[PDB]
Amino acid sequence: GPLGSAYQLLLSKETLNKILQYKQNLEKGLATPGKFFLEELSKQEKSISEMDITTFTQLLIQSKKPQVFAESQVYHDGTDWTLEEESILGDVSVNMPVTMYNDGGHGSSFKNHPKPISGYLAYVPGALLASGSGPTSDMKEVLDNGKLNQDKLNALYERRLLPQLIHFNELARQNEKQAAITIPGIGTGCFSGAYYDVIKPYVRNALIHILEKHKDSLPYIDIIHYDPYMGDEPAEKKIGHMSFRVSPSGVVRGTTGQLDYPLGSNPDTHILVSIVAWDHFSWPGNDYWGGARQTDDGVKAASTDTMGQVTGATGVYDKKWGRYMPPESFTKDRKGMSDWGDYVRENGIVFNGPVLALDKSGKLDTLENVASR
Known part of the structure; x- marks a missing residue:
């Protein structure tokens, strides 16, 4: 983005093929962009x-x-985004280095870090199984006549998570460290819609299946800390060389927060990566661009310098409310209406950064290179 904006967009090979088909259709005049x-x-x-x-x-x-x-x-039509655009946007993830100012507790339960922690976020859109209008792209993919199809849901999450796992497996090696990754109940909130009572075991089965399938490509990933809060039993499973942990913080007292080092990891031996349940259509942090420290997306963005990484501005962490605020100069001269979304509009900020794709060989490369091979 602007000057001091450092984030990286990633997408799978299958997503790249969808983009190539859409670009070609537009070039031929046989498709119409959404509004x-x-x-x-x-x-x-x-x-x-x-x-x-x-x-x-x-x-x-x-x-x-x-x-x-x-x-x-x-509405999933021309008036906002078409289904073809939506299928592509759901597969796009974005990672960024962040300073983490608290452990990421929802509401008033956050614990401020005495010294802010240096780590990484990876925003990944979950399976969108709720709609106020017609069916969504994700619904047409993973629902067969109404059933959540575990195999199709697996393929969906493998598509969207594997590029980020490959990135941070490589990032850990570069730093002579291993990776500890904290994962929330991705897609189990409002995105699950009518499937709230079946989705949570389906999601961890997908996480296990992705890690089991690709364990040989992730030798520097060591600990996966999965926290669906509630609705799942605590467990540990060795997956190849990795420790996969189901630690629902609403069931287990003393669980480490999402923005904190899980048991068995520390800053000397591990890099800390947290997956963020993202959204097909929103910038990273979604709700918090409107000042709301809500949902996993908005809680983690407010509790990091995410908005500083997207806008390039230097915010100020409010330790009483657990939220990374815009610069004071902004929240005083425009004091009443001065959330981060107002800063974006006043400065003409757009969301646009480098993008790479995961090719068939398991390496991240430019879209031009992956398409040519």
Whole structure:
């Protein structure tokens, strides 16, 4: 993004193929962009054929808005995003280094870190199984006549999580460390919709299946700390060389927070990575762009310098409310209405950064290189 914005977008090979088909369809005049993607294309000068696959992908990602309720405010047609665009945006993840100012507890339960922790976030959109209008792209993929299909849900989460796991397996090796990864109940909140009573065992089965399938590609990943809060039994499972842990903090007293080192890891031996349950249509942090420290997405963004990594501005952590605030100068001269979404609008900030793809060999590369092979 702007000057001091450091984040990296990632997507799978299968997602890249969807982007290539969509770009080709547009080049032939056989498809029509949704309202918001149409707006981003209108504001730049390149025709579809002139732009490379990376620029095209970045512009589709740029159509995301800071705050969107994907489960209730989207129509899945031309008036906002089409199903073809939605299928691509759900597969896009974004990682960034962050300072973590508290352990990420919801509400008033957060524990401030005496010294803020240096780690990483990986925002990944969960399976969207709720809609205020027609069915969603994820529904058409993982639901067979109404049944959640465990195998299809597995393939969905493998598509979206594996690029981030490959990134942080490689990042840990670069730092002569292992990786400790904390995972929330991704897609088990509002995204589950009518499937709230079956989704949570399905999600951990998907996590286990991804780690079991790709254990030989993740030798520097050591600990996976999965915390669905409630609705699951505590357990530990050795998966190859990795320790997979189901530690529901609402059932087990003393569980380490999502933005904290799990048992058996420390800053000398491990890098700390937290997965964030993201949203097809929103910037990283979603709700907190409107000042609401709510949901896993908004809690983790408010409890990190996420908004500083997206905007390039230097915020100030409010240790009484557990939220990373905009610069004081902004929250005084525009004191009443000065959340991070207001800063974005006043400064013309857009969401747009480098993007890589996971090729068939398990390496992250430019979209141009992965498409040519």
